Symmetry: none
Subunit: 675 residues, 2 copies
């Protein structure tokens, strides 16, 4: 009989453990490039002296050796270079074989076949399939990350923390990346088979999958549904009918599965952190060390002049014209890999932004931009350096505009309000790690200014009255809003100040929703005198136009005769009533544990359409949706439910409580699961 | 000023599209007979009431009205008989004219002139030339084929499939008809001006070009180079020095172009499917619906009253006499047209065979033969019915002949081993369509027996039938058969009597050519077994690569024979022709296929031998994918080694296209590869 294969033992557990791919729920053989994996192949006879076995691996719809998307290699006693198979031992008809792949191999799904030369003939049989991913553990892989703890956080951690809020108060929300949850890896890999690039030229696209710079850019385009091809639909209108309020999501898992389940139609709706969390899931799952970055006072310079304008009218009203030019915060991602296209000094973290803001080469894609390059103002380098540089360095120009007279006039310029407290979750804890100093030099330093001049050069070759808005007491949805406008006359003359104030509910990016309060006043201030004007906005006044952001834009345009106006600005955040989660016993793998959701209605009216949503990788499979009955005024809602720990370690339970009067109330709970 | 033509607008694109001749690469005006075409003729002035225009068309060297090779017709307001010109509109000095031709007009190249009668004088000017072809779309045309699907296949399709192999395994080879490729129509038209018929009497030959029976028959004569006039030179010797191995060709395109290019000397070399593929190109190009037929176990000799003899000696050797009388398969063609010379019931498919076999009317030409007429045994009708009927109905008589004693004796008769699985490519797909029931009635039916007697009766002492052979034999193949691997067979013997008999077995193995041409003995042996009543036994036959490789030809065929004998009883002959597969050869397109966009293709091959493979040449072609034939030299390929060849193709026509490749090297001549490709706009 001719030489043939009887069975193949992929020793999946062993290899996946060695390749650090064992956390994936899948049962498939998952591997990382440039690393050896061992298989046992039982033949029907002994390897003849004149017989030969040649392995064949291929990926994509047009496997080609010249494109590195196909490889043919013989069984040897020594390792070649890229792909190779070494016979380490023979026991009976069983051949212990160690297969190797090149550190530069394209990632994705592969098929392995075996060609057998025996008895003057040739036979071919398919051995099976496997998944190949980037290898942050391999020193020669472009995504190499040498530090153990860092790699665990940027690749293996499926529980995250995203910072939000504003410069006045940095808050945070938990996010379930869940890259290891069932079918998530699969879906993320399929994204590459659905890109505009793939449709344009499948052969070249798959061959380019050996480049994290390429895979990263494609993902930044595919995470949004713009260009009629992607996952998430952006919506910053404050009205989310026909979809889900962006702030209600707790992770990337539901978004990706819903995307697949709906035949790849847009998932409604998401905002920047939602795009970032989902992008982070794709990057980590594929093997690209990545993390979520939040930039506060993030600007959108549309005409590449490193400057943005914000307008107000004399009545103190913010104008749509630029109300969203400087977001309270904006979230994006950073990917870790070298930049062979830029040089040895631009490796490391690379900015990737999936939020559809600026079109790049005609498509809503953004990055990879070297963070180090951004810090030095080398904006001619790929990709999208000008836009990203502006997000953290732009100047903010305040304008006054009177539509009635058609006149417009410069009020002031601030070169440092934009690009503050750039944050990311610390390695191994929920602490806030500030990485502002990574994106730019200290405000005031020469470098800061030298860099700015540098970048700009490449793109385009006294008030007597001081004001400040202060928050009085606690701000929470249901309670009245109390503020104070503090004014002081610094001149030696008595001044008469005319004050025009407004309050508008907004979306975090600055989208103006509706006026909820306005007032004016005239105060006479003596030299050096300080006066306060109280600002009170009741719940009845703002509740009707307040959105899930729980934000209000307070503005005070003050003016003294013969002097330029003085604009006082302040975006405030009202806290949602508290929502709490509590485990009612010790947590242990595969053992049910009861949990408790606590919530008290602070309103004088009942709260209806109450829905509780809970999830957490390693604690629960998927999303748990619980309908909660109408809760009367001052009443408490006690909800109980069980979770079933499946993986030991420090886990994260997340919940969303949405009702007619309170959309997207969030709750987070850290749980240590024991073996 | 006298009336005169300033210019003429043939509206070539418009007319060719309407006439279904737009696929031809040519720029010329190509039209079909019996169908109107419109022209715009700009005169120097308005057409006067007392002026007149006479159109004049002519074809051939001796155009005459009486011969229909010349026609003179006036510009009128109503259409008429054969040729006619109708003035549809007059704008300024431009005349919109609709010219019509008769459905019985001779095909070929025409010249059109204009005679103008003006101011008491007569002027004449040549307008131009055009090509007239048969019109399968016209109901009154003898080649009319009403069904859309069939017509597209039998006329418009330039990619084909020809079935080959044997009754034990029907294989298939792709063929590039390429009737639309550059110069092909011109060359096929030129054949008519080169026939023995044309040289004899050009006047009559040309006038006969209005008849598909005539054109078809002439083509059957000119596709072969016999009679010192024609295209392909046959060669079934297994040695093709000075020419090309018949199995290496992939189409009719290189063949016809080589013919023209060589000054019309013989193209070496071809075998039946090559003649058929080439004849198919000519037929489709000229407008005659046609297809390729393959008859397995085809009677090539049988010139002795519907019967062929095959001889063997007692040692089990096949004898040269009759070894090639019954080809494993023979390929020919069928043309679609009415038979006004035979009657209304004989129209349809007509057998046409360009393979030089039997001389007819002093020339190597064959057909047309009504397929319906063959089925009915009406072998008195033209043309060559006796022979074609025999190819599919002949009896096969096996003989034993001992040279030493000069004695020969009938072994057995098989009235149904010949004429099997007659096949042709299905309409629209590569599927195999069996048409055996179209050539003859089922075996066992009284119909086929009646027809046989009938046919036999129109053509032109005791063999006591013994008792059951007692010994039954059959040869079976063990494992796959491939060039490079050893051949393994098993002779199964069974004693059906009940007295325990002793059997002497003499076996041999001869490499052959598909037609039966014996090449060389590569194995022989003998055995004497004793079988008890009802007992079965099996003798193993093994032939190593080393033993046959030296004498195996591109056919990769071997004739296995076993002469078995029991005392006091006629011998039992067991025969089996086998086929060894070539190593795999595969083609891979490395991207989507789109019109006018280059795409890379990959040639994949692995040498299964323990020795190198040299003089490797890759030949690729496919109408609508490449212009002509791409020849690629491939470096010496080592043992168990793989070849990595890439090359680009450039789709030029959307639709399902067929890429063909031939890979020949010193150890493996003519390995074939086929790949269907969908080209989008
Ligand atoms: Br605040
Ligand atoms: Br066979
Ligand atoms: Ca998109
Ligand atoms: Ca001839
Ligand atoms: Cl998966
Ligand atoms: Cl031509």
């Amino acid at each position: 009989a001719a030489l043939g294969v009887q069975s193949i033992n992929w020793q999946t557990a062993f290899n996946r453990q060695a390749h650090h791919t064992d956390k994936f729920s899948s049962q498939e053989l998952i591997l990382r490039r440039g690393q050896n994996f061992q298989v046992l192949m039982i033949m029907n006879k002994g390897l003849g002296s004149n017989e030969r076995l040649e392995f064949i691996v291929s990926t994509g719809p047009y496997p080609s050796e010249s494109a590195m998307t196909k490889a043919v290699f013989p069984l040897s006693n020594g390792s070649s270079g890229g792909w190779s198979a070494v016979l380490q031992a023979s026991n009976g008809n069983t051949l212990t074989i160690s297969i190797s792949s090149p550190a530069s191999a394209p990632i994705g799904r592969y098929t392995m076949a075996l060609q057998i030369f025996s008895q003057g003939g040739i036979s071919s049989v398919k051995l099976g399939t496997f998944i190949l991913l980037f290898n942050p553990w391999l020193n020669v892989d472009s995504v190499f990350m040498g530090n153990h703890a860092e790699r665990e956080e940027y690749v293996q951690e499926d529980a995250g923390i995203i910072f939000v809020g504003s410069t006045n108060r940095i808050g945070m929300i938990g996010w379930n990346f869940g890259q290891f949850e069932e079918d998530i890896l699969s879906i993320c890999l399929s994204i590459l088979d659905r890109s505009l690039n793939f449709r344009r030229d499948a052969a070249t696209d798959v061959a380019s999958r050996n480049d994290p710079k390429y895979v990263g850019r494609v993902l930044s385009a595919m995470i949004n549904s713009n260009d009629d091809n992607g996952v998430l639909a952006g919506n910053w209108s404050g009205t989310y009918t026909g979809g889900r309020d962006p702030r209600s999501w707790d992770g990337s898992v539901e978004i990706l599965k819903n995307w697949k389940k709906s035949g790849l139609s847009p998932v409604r709706y998401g905002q920047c952190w939602v795009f970032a969390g989902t992008l982070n899931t794709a990057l980590r799952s594929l093997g690209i060390p990545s993390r979520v970055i939040t930039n506060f006072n993030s600007a959108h310079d549309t005409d590449r002049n490193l400057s943005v304008d914000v307008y107000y009218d004399p009545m103190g009203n913010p104008l749509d014209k630029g109300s969203d030019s400087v977001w309270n915060f904006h979230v994006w991602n950073e990917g870790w890999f070298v930049r062979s296209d830029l040089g040895p000094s631009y490796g490391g973290w690379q900015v990737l932004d999936a939020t559809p803001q600026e079109r790049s080469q005609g498509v809503f894609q953004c990055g990879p931009a070297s963070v180090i390059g951004v810090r030095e103002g080398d904006v001619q380098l790929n990709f999208d350096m000008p836009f990203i540089f502006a997000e953290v360095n732009a100047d903010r120009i305040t304008w006054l505009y009177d539509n009635t007279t058609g006149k417009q006039w410069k009020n002031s310029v601030n070169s440092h309000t934009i690009g503050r407290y750039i944050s990311t979750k610390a390695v191994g804890s929920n602490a806030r790690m500030d990485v502002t100093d990574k994106y730019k030099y200290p405000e005031g330093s020469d470098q800061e200014r030298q860099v700015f001049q540098k970048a700009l050069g490449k793109l385009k070759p006294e008030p007597s009255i001081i004001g400040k808005l202060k928050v009085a007491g606690m701000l929470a949805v249901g309670k009245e809003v109390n503020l104070v406008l503090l004014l002081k006359n610094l001149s030696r003359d008595t001044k008469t100040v005319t004050v025009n104030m407004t309050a508008w509910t907004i979306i975090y990016n600055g989208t103006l929703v509706h006026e909820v309060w306005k007032d004016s006043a005239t105060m006479s201030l003596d030299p050096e005198e300080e006066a306060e004007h109280p600002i009170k906005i009741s719940y009845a006044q703002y509740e009707r136009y307040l959105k899930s952001d729980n934000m209000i834009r307070i503005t005070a345009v003050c003016k003294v005769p013969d002097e330029s106006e003085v604009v006082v600005e302040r975006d405030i955040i009202l806290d949602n009533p508290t929502l709490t989660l509590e485990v009612l016993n010790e947590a242990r793998v595969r053992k049910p544990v009861n949990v408790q959701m606590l919530f008290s209605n602070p309103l004088d009216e009942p709260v209806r359409d109450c829905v509780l949503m809970v999830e957490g990788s390693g604690l629960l499979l998927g999303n748990l949706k619980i309908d909660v009955p109408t809760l009367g005024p001052k009443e408490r809602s006690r909800v109980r439910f069980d979770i079933l720990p499946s993986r030991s370690g420090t886990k994260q339970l997340l919940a969303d409580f949405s009702c007619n009067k309170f959309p997207a109330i969030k709750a987070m709970l850290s749980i240590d699961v024991a073996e």
